[PDB]
Amino acid sequence: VTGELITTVNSGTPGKGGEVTFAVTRDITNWNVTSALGNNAVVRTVTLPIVPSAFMVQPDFTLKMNTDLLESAELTSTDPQTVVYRIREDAVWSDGVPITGDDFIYFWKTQNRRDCPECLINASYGHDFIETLEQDETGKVVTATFSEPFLGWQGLFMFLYPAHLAEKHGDIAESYNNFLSNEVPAWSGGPYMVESFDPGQLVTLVPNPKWYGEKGPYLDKLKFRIITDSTQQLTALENGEVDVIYPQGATQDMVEQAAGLDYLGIDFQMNPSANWYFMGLNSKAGPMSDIALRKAVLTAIDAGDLKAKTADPYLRNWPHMGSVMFLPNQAGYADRRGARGYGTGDVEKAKGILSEAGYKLSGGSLLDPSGKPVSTLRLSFPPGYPAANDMARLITGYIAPLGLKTDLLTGPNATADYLLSGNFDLHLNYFSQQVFPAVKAGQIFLRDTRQNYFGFNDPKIEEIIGKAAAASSIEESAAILSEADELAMDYAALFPIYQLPTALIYKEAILNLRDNPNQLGPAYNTAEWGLAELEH
């Protein structure tokens, strides 16, 4: 029985001074997390201490307005939708220049698809729904007017950049694509700022002397040490080379090892991630273009056994995920997978689905309706996730009674970015869920979107997602979006499995360090990090 909540784990009041080193798994070649090439958890973690945010995702998956930056943010009208931001007078960049509407306007122009068509952004995420963005004479009152309703407005302006510096480095595209992406940032609007960068080795941050927030910073230096081999991170922690690690794809052996290091002052936190494992099925081409084969495969997969073999031995009460649009804790969630018989391990039902579509078993091999053997299925998955490797082998075994064979494929060319209609049949990977399911869904399920790898092609799904993204609450959005989840599961091109576990493993002298099991991650509150005081 504990008094800590997910939002208050490891709380305390640290002393002043000292250093903390946090291991990260990628080198930094792009410093702009909002760009296409900078959008990953490492860049996000390393730049969260320097980039101010209007709202921040918290460990309970809520959005909290940043009261260091903002006095208020208010939806002041809905005819048309209007949001007013009042920036604190004392919010300033590290050179003393106030943070103002100039910074909101610059970011909006880079993200809105219109004013900077050459900006190489990750995604607009609704900034394009803002049609006018104006500021008062003081620069501290910013009014956004929308061309149509948009639920996810608190997700906007989550990363602000110094417009007065960008303007010294070319036009907007040049400054966004070059200055803000390629240069080590000399500026900050947060508690820390970069002192030095040793490529491939170490980012060193120091306090921003003009930090304007309520708390911190407490450390003399905050360092991010680059360790690309994530399996060497626990050794580095034990040796004192780093004080915090946050590896992806934690295993039972990793948990047991970390637990054995308690005598060295090491502790750990683990939670269900916003990242969720899935198996995608190639509905565009190859054997999986036949929905009957997709449904038969999904019905034969035994999801209980999959989780029993790969999660249950070291993770208690770990939830199945039976939706492709909602995590188990989000409004709208239901087991739409199991409602359709997917994941039930039901070989006889799967064989019936195949027989009713004209397939036949001959000599232990499945024949397509024309009479030709179904090809060996190409099941690919990216490296670095032992659970995915184990699940690929288990899935091979579940479908072998259907007369199907698999070829297991991996390596650096087996990433989602490199998928082609012609180079896979099944693919195991993960998606990262967002606070607004309808916003994430618009990136995955629409024709011609960046993450529609498995061939969803349904104007009704797209219409539903658009209505859900226009709703006035997350709850109403979920009620609307549930219909799209049903239709997406009917199509059987995406099979949800379960959430990845996070693993934050660290020296317990560090206070206010806690898991934030979402894309924003543990560096959401570095102003509060510090070392516990020893006794005088």
Numbering used by the authors: 31 to 566
The authors write:
The EDTA transporter system is composed of a periplasmic binding protein, EppA, and a type I ABC-type importer consisting of a heterodimer of its transmembrane domain components, EppB and EppC, and a dimer of its nucleotide binding domain component, EppD. EppA binds free EDTA, but not metal–EDTA complexes, restricting the ability of Chelativorans sp. BNC1 to use only weak metal–EDTA complexes that can dissociate to free EDTA, making it imperative to determine the biophysical mechanism of EppA’s binding specificity before any improvements to its binding capabilities can be engineered. Based on its three-domain, bilobate structure, the β2β1β3βnβ4 configuration of the core β-sheet of Domain III, and the two-β-strand hinge, EppA is a Class II Cluster C periplasmic binding protein. In summary, EppA’s affinity for EDTA, EDDA, and EGTA, and its putative affinity for other APC chelators via molecular docking, suggests that it is a general binding protein for aminopolycarboxylates.
EppA crystallized without its ligand EDTA in the tetragonal space group P43212 with one molecule in the asymmetric unit. For both structures, all but the first four N-terminal residues (Gln27 through Leu30) of the mature protein (Gln27 through Glu563) were visible, and the C-terminal His-tag from pET30a(+) was visible through its first three His residues. Based on the relatively weak (e.g., no large, hydrophobic intermolecular interfaces) crystallographic and non-crystallographic protein–protein interactions in both the P43212 and P212121 crystal lattices, EppA is monomeric, which we confirmed by calculating a molecular mass of 63 kDa for the single chromatographic peak observed by analytical size-exclusion chromatography. The tertiary structure of EppA was bilobate and composed of three domains, denoted here by convention used for periplasmic binding proteins as Domains I, II, and III. Through the comparison to other Class II Cluster C PBPs and the support by molecular docking of EDTA (Section 2.3), the interface of Domains I and III established the putative ligand-binding cleft, with one end of the cleft capped by Domain II. Highlighting the counterbalancing charges, electron densities for two sulfate ions were clearly observed to be bound electrostatically in the ligand-binding cleft by Arg56 (water-mediated), Arg74, Lys470, and Arg480. Of the four cationic residues identified by molecular docking, Arg480 was the only residue situated outside of binding cleft within a short loop (Arg477 through Gln481). The loop had two conformers: Conformer A had a refined occupancy of 60% and was held in place outside of the binding clef by Asp447, and Conformer B had a refined occupancy of 40% and was oriented toward the binding cleft.
